[PDB]
């Protein structure tokens, strides 16, 4: 079935090894990563970096910091990339220290530019969300019909938030 | 398309045998109930092609496809204006060895093209 | 049944190769560990590093 896995991030090496330092902010990923999942994580990392430069240029945290992110395993490989979107916000939060809004869930696939692609298992993921107590959910617009094909009694309290580009999510998860 | 037409015909058969309707006249207005809401709502990933991304054509095993080659700046342009280090390139997409070499060749050609057409542009 | 095992740690290389050196504190692990156990040990290592940087920022041992 579905599940609600908490993608986590941490700073596994001090930020300021050298204030002048021009070295890269390596990222290490765990969670029984596959090859496609490794590439998706790299894409999400690059998009998060570029988004930070565009939005908060003074924030060199993500560019120059060695980070470890864990994506819990269990998801089928075909659905592995659906965690991409999550990854992004995770890193961004760690960059700004702002916790993501409570009882909020999200699944999506990023394409190195921030645009969000459809995913599978929408019904099972929505069931897991409802059982986990989350009241706000984020899905790609291309999956919207799949979320609207569900019964009404399964969508009570779910303040759904459909998106097509990651920018919108930054206005949702990080409201202020 | 065969699967979809078979599905609509099966539901028409059900609507005929036991259903009130002795005959069926399928129309888009009715179609929503015969097969459901449409899946492919977008003809493409997008229609704007922002900077750094370009559409291309691929001859995959399951026919042809339109794939968007995307680019992003994964590190700030100006670490130090004096800084003379080259712009290392990262690449993904299950790239093969020959494709890695081709990507390097294209990168160098783009660099030389910018050299010729815009020397002031040290971006690439 | 159960058992009372002992997790042991040791410094298998001198701390200061180069006082300026900004290299990584690589970790070697044994115990016929599976892949999931290796990942769990890596997670614990990173959490310990972060906890030390939070509680004892001057302690660059880990």
- Residues 6 or more apart from B21 whose CB is under 8 A from it? B15
* CA dihedral for A174, A26, A77, A7, sign (positive or negative): negative
Task: Determine how many CB atoms are found less than 10 A away from the CB of residue B12.
Answer: 18
Task: Determine how many CB atoms are found less than 10 A away from the CB of residue B64.
Answer: 9
Nearest to A5 by CA among A31, A24, A28, A29: A31
Write the Ramachandran bin of A140: left for phi over 0, alpha for psi from -120 to 50, otherwise beta.
beta
Tell the residue number behind the tokens 């496609």, with chain if given: A36
The structure was resolved experimentally with cryo-EM
Tell the residue number behind the tokens 């005959």, with chain if given: B23
Nearest to A100 by CA among A18, A5, A25, A169: A169
Q: Cβ of A113 under 8 Å from any chain B Cβ?
A: yes
Query: To the nearest 10°, the Cα dihedral for B8, B11, B16, B22?
Result: -40
Q: Do residues A29 and A38 make contact, with C-beta atoms less than 8 angstroms apart?
A: yes
Q: And the tokens for B73?
A: 């700046």
What is the C-alpha radius of gyration for chain B, rounded to an integer number of angstroms?
Answer: 26
Q: Do residues A43 and A98 make contact, with C-beta atoms less than 8 angstroms apart?
A: no
Q: Do residues B105 and A44 make contact, with C-beta atoms less than 8 angstroms apart?
A: no
**Residue A59 and residue A25: Cα distance in Å, rounded?**
13
For C50, the closest of A10, A21, A31 (CB atoms) is A10
Q: Cβ of A64 under 8 Å from any chain B Cβ?
A: no
Q: Do residues A83 and A17 make contact, with C-beta atoms less than 8 angstroms apart?
A: no
**Residue C38 and residue B100: Cα distance in Å, rounded?**
32
What are the CA-CA distances from residue B64 to residues A118, B3, B58 (Å)?
A: 20, 21, 6
Helices A166-173 and A84-96 pack at an angle, to 10 degrees, of 50
Under DSSP, the state recorded for A115 is: B
**Residue A46 and residue A92: Cα distance in Å, rounded?**
12
- Residues 6 or more apart from B10 whose CB is under 8 A from it? none
**Residue B37 and residue B2: Cα distance in Å, rounded?**
17
Q: Cβ of B76 under 8 Å from any chain A Cβ?
A: yes
User: Does C contact A via 3+ CB–CB distances below 8 Å?
Assistant: yes
**Residue C54 and residue C62: Cα distance in Å, rounded?**
13
Residues of C with CB under 8 A from a CB of A: 22, 24, 35-36, 39, 42-43, 45-47, 49-50, 53, 57, 60
Chain-centre distance for alpha carbon A11: 17
**Residue A24 and residue A62: Cα distance in Å, rounded?**
9
**Residue C53 and residue C62: Cα distance in Å, rounded?**
9
State the nearest Cα–Cα gap between C35 and chain A, in angstroms.
8
State the nearest Cα–Cα gap between B92 and chain A, in angstroms.
6
Task: Determine how many CB atoms are found less than 10 A away from the CB of residue B13.
Answer: 12
**Residue C41 and residue C37: Cα distance in Å, rounded?**
6
Q: Do residues A45 and B96 make contact, with C-beta atoms less than 8 angstroms apart?
A: no
Residues in chain C within 8 Å Cβ distance of A30? 39, 42-43
Q: What angle do CA C50, C56, C61 make, to 5 degrees?
A: 75
Q: Is A142 helix (H, G, I), strand (E, B) or coil?
A: helix
For C3-60, give the secondary structure using H, E and C.
CCCCCCCCCCCCCCCCCCCCCCCCCCCCCCCCHHHHHHHHHHHHHHHHHHHHHCCCCC
**Residue B43 and residue A3: Cα distance in Å, rounded?**
32
Q: Do residues A94 and A52 make contact, with C-beta atoms less than 8 angstroms apart?
A: no
**Residue B68 and residue B42: Cα distance in Å, rounded?**
15
* Strand bridging mode A8-11 / A67-70: antiparallel
Cβ distance of A113 and B53 shorter than 8 Å: yes
Q: Is A139 helix (H, G, I), strand (E, B) or coil?
A: strand
Helices B28-35 and B2-17 pack at an angle, to 10 degrees, of 90
Q: Do residues B79 and A122 make contact, with C-beta atoms less than 8 angstroms apart?
A: no
**Residue B17 and residue B24: Cα distance in Å, rounded?**
12
- Residues 6 or more apart from A51 whose CB is under 8 A from it? A88, A92, A114, A166, A170
**Residue A72 and residue C43: Cα distance in Å, rounded?**
12
- C61 phi and psi angles, rounded to 5 deg: -60, -50
Nearest to A10 by CA among A72, A89, A67: A67
Q: What is A43-76 written as a DSSP string?
A: HHHHHHHHHHHHH-TT--TTTS--EEEE--S-S-
Q: Do residues A80 and A40 make contact, with C-beta atoms less than 8 angstroms apart?
A: yes
**Residue A102 and residue B104: Cα distance in Å, rounded?**
45
What are the CA-CA distances from residue A145 to residues A126, B36, B37, B38, C55 (Å)?
A: 13, 9, 7, 8, 49
Q: Is A125 helix (H, G, I), strand (E, B) or coil?
A: helix
Q: Do residues A170 and A92 make contact, with C-beta atoms less than 8 angstroms apart?
A: yes
For B75, the closest of A35, A63, A112 (CB atoms) is A63
**Partners of A27 in the beta sheet?**
A67
Q: And the tokens for B85?
A: 């280090």
């Amino acid at each position: 079935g579905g599940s609600t896995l908490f993608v986590e991030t941490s700073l596994r090496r001090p930020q300021d090894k050298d204030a002048k330092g021009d070295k890269d902010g390596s990222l290490e990923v765990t969670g029984q990563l596959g090859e496609v999942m490794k590439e998706s994580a790299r894409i999400a990392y690059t998009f998060a970096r570029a988004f930070l430069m565009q939005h908060a240029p003074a924030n060199d945290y993500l560019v120059t910091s060695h980070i470890h992110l864990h994506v819990p395993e269990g998801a089928t490989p075909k659905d592995g990339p659906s965690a991409g979107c999550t990854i992004v916000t995770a890193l961004l939060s760690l960059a700004m220290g702002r916790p993501v809004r409570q009882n909020l869930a999200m699944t999506g696939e990023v394409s190195l530019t921030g645009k969000i692609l459809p995913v599978g298992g929408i019904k099972e993921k929505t069931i897991a969300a409802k059982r986990a107590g989350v009241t706000c959910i984020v899905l790609p617009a291309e999956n919207k019909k799949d979320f609207y094909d569900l019964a009404a009694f399964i969508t009570e309290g779910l303040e759904v938030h459909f998106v097509e580009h990651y920018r919108e999510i930054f206005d949702i998860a990080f409201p202020d | 398309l065969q699967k979809q037409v078979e599905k609509v015909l099966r539901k028409s058969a059900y609507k005929i045998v036991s259903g009130e309707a002795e005959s069926v006249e399928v129309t888009p207005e009715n179609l929503q109930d015969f097969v459901g809401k449409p899946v492919f709502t977008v003809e493409r990933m997008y229609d704007v092609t922002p900077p750094g991304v370009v559409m291309g054509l691929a001859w995959t095993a399951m026919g042809g496809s339109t794939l968007f080659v995307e680019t992003s700046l994964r590190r700030p342009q100006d670490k130090d204006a004096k800084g003379d280090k080259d712009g290392s390139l990262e690449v993904t997409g299950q790239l093969g060895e020959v494709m890695k070499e081709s990507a390097r060749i294209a990168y160098t050609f783009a660099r030389a093209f910018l050299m010729q057409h815009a020397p002031a542009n040290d971006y690439l």
